[model samples]
Target: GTAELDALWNLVEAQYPVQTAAVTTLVTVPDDYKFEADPPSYALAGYETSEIAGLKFPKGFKFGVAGAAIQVEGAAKAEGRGPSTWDYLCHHYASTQCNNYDPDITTNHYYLYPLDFARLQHLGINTYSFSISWTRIYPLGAGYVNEAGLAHYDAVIHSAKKYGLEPVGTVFHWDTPLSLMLKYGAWQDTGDQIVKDFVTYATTVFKRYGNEVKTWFTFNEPRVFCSQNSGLPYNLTYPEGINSTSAVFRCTYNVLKAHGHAVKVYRDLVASGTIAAGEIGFKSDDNYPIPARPGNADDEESAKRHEAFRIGIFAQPVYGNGDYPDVVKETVGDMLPALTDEDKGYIKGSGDIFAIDGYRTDISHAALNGIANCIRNQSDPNWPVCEEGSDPFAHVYPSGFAIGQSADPLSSWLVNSAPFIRDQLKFLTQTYPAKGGIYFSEFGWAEDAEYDRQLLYQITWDGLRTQYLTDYLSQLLLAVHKDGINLRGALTWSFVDNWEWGLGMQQKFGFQFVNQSDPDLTRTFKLSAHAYAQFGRNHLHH
Candidate 1:
């Protein structure tokens, strides 16, 4: 039946082969044969064909593309634009160095948006998700509005509408104005006053663009922002001295405060009919948990702690009904700083939709013998270890370390099963009862590549990357649906390989493999792309 043929075609399209060389080669035959098949056979040579007859997905399913303004936009400094953190850091310390450091000219999307719109139209993509440059809008970070910036985005929104695509706008996506970072140390400012200022910025954007852009995201991975900045002791420190444990919680509080303020403005304004029916939420990088060892209590608890720090830190504030997790309080204590009851009230139940960004899972267990402690201290002499590799600020889980050394059955289960996702949603539902919905805004895998030696084994790619991504995503989708926690949509990390912060073009996270070596930009769809496209087309009936 055509059902089998459609299923095969869908698989090939969704699991784009171009991104990974291995998968690319394996899927070539299907790609070639499918184009020529008259009545596609259900079976391939010896096996009986698998039928995709009655399986169907829920109504109103959505798929979209995610693009960051800083990475893709070339005109970083032009059009009355001010410097962003990426502009400053990449120009100074980035290994590859940002080629368009000044943002004098980017992909020139401001000028060449027509071509961009045309391409999206060709792909039958219904939604185009992108971010706005805060500096571009308010060059000094707060004072005056940049008319040129508003005009530029207005034009893009209009162009997207013309092309029959829904514009999904993100207010913040890691490109906080350098001025803000310098002035108040970014999220370090605990006062509701900062929240008010952020609310003002958000309200201005929403009021201006809300008429056309219906989907709005408050922030992109608040947890990442907090952990990356300030050291874990809740002390304001640069990246080199960052204490992730404490910083994450403190930063999350600020992010939630900011988000709640914005949501309040949106609801109040939109209800009054001053703004449109624009929905608001935040995006989280949902890290799944895996026990380090079989039936080991410490290993299981370690995995839970990692998840609590990485995912729950943000999710709990928006969704959970609590002050903060006990684990966080114990780890950071008074160093976490004072949170106003007002801020807590504002943060609770802030999101209209909960967006998730799932990529990989880490295994966890206590670090014994201080092996990791030696490695971390080697990079920074002041590296503190309260319990070998454990500190009041953070603890090292041996399972994550061991997985990197030798793969295990639990690693496979973590990567290719729905248990982790089910657990996350279950926890979220018990915490925050969403009035709107939950969705996966970003989920993807990077091609396995060698880690740059400079980051101290913190970031790298390995060859088993494609399988890793496929396994995790397959499990994630099944688990999310099984839980029925108002799951709505899933957007992969990106449509093309892009410039990752400080890494430049070293890492590839695109479904379509972009030829970084090519003088002219060119993209070839990877096996995963084919896989995703197929997955979408045959979602319900598979």
Candidate 2:
């Protein structure tokens, strides 16, 4: 008999007399294993607790999940909310960029957040980091506020508290209101209008949810979104001679200034007891740079230059000495706006926590024609280039050299660099020392490309992602236990499968598998989610 029939026949034999020869049949029961055994290399894949048996997090350390509004929330035009650039650009200019998938119905989190919070509670996640859509509050990113927008976030925050989850709100996550972009070119506007308008929007959010959410993030990866200025149609509004590179620097300067101003506003509110005292910071992201030729002086200098360009552009102003890095200023020249002493007054010490979203660790090599040559000639193709691991011009360290355990299948730029976690954590600690400590604000890896072809039961066993998280967290434990790095907390990249910026739904980073075919958009916990839950239960300090 088949596996199903064998079980049925066995049940019948147990209940009634099956000694009659008329219905005799060979009932060979097949192995009914629900999950595959962990691979030998990934010892911690299926939550093998031996490695971290006695490890405990520091008291009050937060373990949580993070999601962006544009990526997760679906009801793009609902509840009096206006359209954002993601809606405008993703549909109008770059339909194919987001895999031709309309983001209007992404994950249905706009309505299904209650169910998500319940799952987070069940999984023992104590903190929930989510972004508020800027257009939802102020449709135009200025003037009048939308009460419906306020009520939506009000309910989201309330639900977090109801599930005993700490609400960590991010003010913006790359969703610029279309109206603002059309009106003043948004961040590309050379004037302080975007900065002023951003502060206004931030103030509105702070006043509304300040009492509920004690921890706030001003912006999520300004460096990333600022660099994406060319991808969108913002250049349509730029005057003559304003290239994408210059616009990026302008975006960077404006965003840093805006974050500084927003933190000042939040502090003023706290000083007046208008809101509960809390932490405020912006999330910065960068690929950790390793020297291409280890111990080589030029490669070492190249690594430092990569750091200055990628992380220091934003971190130097807010976290460092409230100025642009000298490498950046000298290379980019007049393109990068100056942060005057007056600007530095509010910019420095604005971040309460040094937040980072590190994914890949890449090799940094000196430019093709020396750093000095690249700096001298802006016309050179490799100008300001430190040659990242994935760059076409980047030279491999050696034969068969691998940066990490393995590269992610779908998002190839991301490698399973679990071994580099401690180094990155320590880097953040020394580079951007904060009173509130450092937080791994975002970290995750998407399952391989073959996920959709698997059977329903097979899909739940997300072995690679589970292994990735297990290994990453193992390093984090060592960092806290042995290295004495004050890592305040860590939030995984996502809680649910949602649209991945321009890449859309193809790359899934969610711990829970979101079935797009289902009418209800069912979120089923993958094997990694179970492992993650076990992690919290075992390690979190009681």
Candidate 3:
């Protein structure tokens, strides 16, 4: 059966017509593409590799990089792949905010995956973390199964294994099929069908790729994506008269339910010996919170409340006790959905691994008026009563606080939070306590001034990014060997520069810089990539 499937997919591969000019030139480099002056390479010469070499990881620890299908695949309409929300967003809303860049021909990973895997092998990275495009498989959300989609990932997994890489799969990664959204608002659907559709899609992938991909994440950053429901870039399929706030809550509830049920299906498959035993979980992200005034009782309480609303809202249900945080319940009241006892049963232990996409940290302080006053008055602009450096949707007074001393000009949302790296790791480890292990699924800094279209040599000499990774990894080692946190892996944000959603191609979060001007879109390793490669080569358990 395996050989037959392989052969079948091989035939499908041949059917994909050669790349055409129209497809290749859907997105083009500006006529006047500018570049900065060539810069000298950084003296990345530091720490005796011997010192880190002595501190080896445990036998099973993974060292790798991550990317999402929509961000890197770039086969937008190829081989019967359906449109994702991102495809719609890139075509419609991206021009207004994203410098007219589109995902149509981003990194062309769909065709260049073999090269990607070869690069990973050269970097000594043993794991490949990527998301399966939901739209690619179940093109219109559910019903028909696209064999070509399965074939593409089948080839992907085969190539990863060919180069001695372990495949870590994410079932959904913010790219919901546009059809689902148009038909039922995707995650915002109040009916049970959306969750059912998600399970069907998840189960199909599990049944197909479960044996090969041992680590699976059901969803990535549900809180961040669900929050998008409020001002969803695309329109229609929302419940009648549903306010954006209510829609956001609905999306959150559906995601929780969908994740729980999909995990339940994977568990059944493993128990039945239908697939190899593996770890399954959801990936979460947040700006690590701190009190504005560390020692002040009110400020500390405000920080706690901020966490309760941010990470706790999702973590408590899945990783804690399967209930919303007390602070969240008290504040949001009826706006929040109730998780039934039955719902809690599966959701509580659905995530075997506690994963996070760490980026930056922020400060939370009590509201200017008073916590109690704001909580009681729903009309208060700061109804949650605690406003941090920034809430996703609300405005607050200028924080005037730096989470880290240095900041990335290109990726403004992130700062050099390297100093607090260990604190964040320990906090999540203590808070979530995933028995499978704590995995830094994604972490990387965009190069300083990377968007300036710097000359290839100058852009590839990423000194700040190199320093950022060094500091973060140093702290990661301390968190593990020193603090004894059960961290299992640290995968960087991207293998190569690809399409960044909303921000589009402006943000370069890749270890390898891809030159869009080159007809072949050549990828060049940055100093950070070299530094990271050294870390993987020296510290990874052999």
Q: Rate the local accuracy (lDDT) of all candidates.
A: 0.58, 0.79, 0.77
lDDT of 2 by residue, 347-423 (tens): 99999998888776777777756777776787776567545335432424555466665534457667677777888
**Per-candidate RMSD vs. true structure?**
12.1, 13.2, 6.8
Give lDDT tens digits, candidate 1, residues 1-542. 22332332233234231121111110111212222111123211222113322334456555666777876665665566665655555544334444322333323444545555655554455667889988778765777778888888998888877875688889988776665655665666644445666787898899899889888999988877765555321243333323544455556676777888888888888988987886788887746455556587655555566666667767776778546666655655664654567767777777777777754445554445342453244243322211222221122244332333222321222233233556666655565566767666776555445223233112222224334444444554565455556766667677666666644555556665545444334444454554454445555322
Q: Order of candidates by lDDT, top first?
A: 2, 3, 1
Q: Which residue runs does candidate 1 get wrong by more than 4 Å?
A: 1-54, 96-113, 190-193, 231-250, 369-423, 430-432, 449-477, 480-485, 515-520, 540-542
lDDT of 3 by residue, 1-542 (tens): 23432332333234242232223432333436333332233355554333354686778788889999889988776776777776666565556755677777788888878777877777788999999999779878887888989988998898899888999999998988877777777877767899999999999999999989999999888888887777645344577745676777778888999999999999999999999999999998874566766687877787788777768888889989899889888877766778989889879988899998887666667777787777787677666745533443122223554556454544566766776778888889888888998898888888766878657778887877887787778777767877788888888888899888777777888989988777677778887888887777777767
Q: Which prediction has the highest lDDT against the true structure? A: 2
* Error in Å for residue 194 of model 2: 0.5
* TM agreement with the true structure for every prediction: 0.74, 0.89, 0.89
Give the C-alpha lDDT of model 1.
0.58
Error of 1 at 463 (Å): 11
Poorly placed runs, candidate 2 (over 4 Å): 1-51, 239-241, 379-381, 388-396
Number of colliding residue pairs in model 2: 0
Q: Please report the TM-score between candidate 1 and the true structure.
A: 0.74
